[PDB]
Symmetry: none
């Protein structure tokens, strides 16, 4: 807010801090050029150039700071292998005689690319008719970023995202987003993508939900013409269920399974000539670990 | 963390020295700058190899006491308000870099004090519930502000006003108001201003005009049958003084023969069992008229 000059560089990288003495006169003799850092209400010395005694660099900076082209007018330095603790205000001061000192300051901000990942829930997801609880389904994390990234979601699911930002000791910020929804049949196998944006980079990872649900039964095998005397036709029970259906049981809307119709393993075979007596509604009851549910087909018997 | 205070016009010494001069460490230059605030301007420089340099506008006001590898102490002369600020003294050294010390300079000003009463003619009057201005105490161009207060047995309201002037000083003005009364007359009113343990004091004496308050004296417990030659005297407390005195009784008439010469009421010679009664003097003044009474007893005793 007091400084008009700001530098930014990523952890690990080098930045060039500039300082020049604008308007040299024959009168002004430049006595010494001093870089200092302040975190604020410390000033501490960084590097010095004296035209007559040479260059000094103080620790911690002994291997990381060096003047580019030391001169009566130039005290530009390079700071290498940038570290988070390098953040601060850097002051460059030209000591001159008899004209006094001149200084210029700048801000150094150190940036860090975050580490991003999506991880799904470790629970099993059940669609139950009872619970209307919003359950955790995926977590997207952007850790150790600086400045903080922006997290968001891309999905067709109707759910709720919570956000949490944590300032770490080192000044980086971890962003966490939790996606919660109420598990339903329509949610199964739906894609859920986590998007993370940092200084215009774009991370994206996807999950596919796995939601358990009780069976949704349909019966296939009845075409238009189950005409009289026709033989060897059958119905198959299609149980849409997660996990898959374990047991099957056939029955009719007019009592138990008749003679001339026997059930094995989810297909109902009608052995022998067809007759009017077999017309009716046939039912299949499929069972999985979640529950039992049923489906039917109206079977009318033709004459062709 | 280090603060200096000096008065306008005086000289102050701003100390700077280098604690632990060390074999390695070569002092390159010594520099004073004044920061007013967020700005650093150069004040004086001492370079061992090149000498001393004082910069405008200080050439005639600043000098190093004893320039040296380790002492940069200066004297700032003829202090002015505009000298307030933070002074930084920096030792440039090699190869250890710069070492600096700061101090705050606060410039002080002793205020100028005085009191003045109203030009108005303070006049007591029944029914006037209104407080009127009677003295103004001023402590002008002080810094920091002084503290103004009154010392009187009057029971009035003092208001205070504090004005921050462009130059940074502060004028303090106190106005003392009261409802004018007979008792307030001739009472002293003293403003007192305390500045840095100095105590200034200046007094006024109120002049309040009032309608007369009448008293009648000359009366004696025992008054004979036939005592001689006996007087009553009407002392009227008034300001300005009463100019007219008129006598009467509570039953209208002045019993012959009682002669009135003003503000004395002589009875010749014989007294009797008449000469009963209430006696009244009516005093008048530019305010005023008002009266007093006496119950007069006479027996053989």
């Amino acid at each position: 807010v007091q400084v008009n000059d700001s530098m930014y560089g990523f952890i690990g990288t080098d930045v060039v801090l500039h300082c020049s003495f604008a308007n040299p006169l024959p009168s002004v003799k430049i006595t010494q050029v001093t870089w200092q850092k302040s975190t604020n209400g410390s000033k501490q010395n960084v590097a010095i150039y004296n035209p007559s005694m040479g260059v000094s660099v103080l620790a911690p900076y002994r291997e990381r700071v060096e003047f580019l082209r030391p001169s009566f007018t130039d005290g530009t330095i390079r700071l290498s292998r940038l570290e988070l603790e390098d953040e601060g205000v850097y002051i460059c001061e030209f000591a001159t005689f008899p004209t006094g000192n001149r200084e210029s300051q700048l801000n150094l901000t150190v940036m860090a690319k975050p580490t991003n990942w999506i991880e799904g829930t470790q629970a099993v997801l059940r669609a139950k008719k009872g619970q209307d609880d919003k359950v955790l389904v995926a977590t997207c994390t952007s850790a150790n970023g600086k400045p903080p990234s922006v997290v968001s979601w891309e999905t067709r699911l109707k759910g709720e995202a919570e956000y949490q930002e944590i300032r770490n000791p080192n000044g980086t910020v971890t962003v966490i987003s939790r996606y919660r929804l109420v598990p339903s049949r329509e949610a199964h196998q739906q894609s859920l993508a986590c998007i993370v944006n940092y200084h215009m980079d774009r991370f994206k990872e996807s999950l596919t939900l796995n939601v358990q649900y009780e069976p949704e039964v349909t019966i296939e095998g009845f075409d238009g013409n189950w005409y009289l005397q026709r033989m060897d036709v059958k119905l198959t029970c299609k149980a849409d269920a997660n996990p898959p259906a374990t047991e099957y049981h056939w029955t009719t809307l007019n009592g138990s399974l008749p003679k001339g119709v026997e059930a094995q393993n989810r297909t109902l075979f009608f052995k022998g000539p067809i007759n009017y007596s077999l017309a009716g509604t046939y039912i299949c009851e499929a069972t999985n670990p979640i529950g039992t549910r049923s489906g039917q087909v109206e079977v009318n018997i033709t004459e062709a």
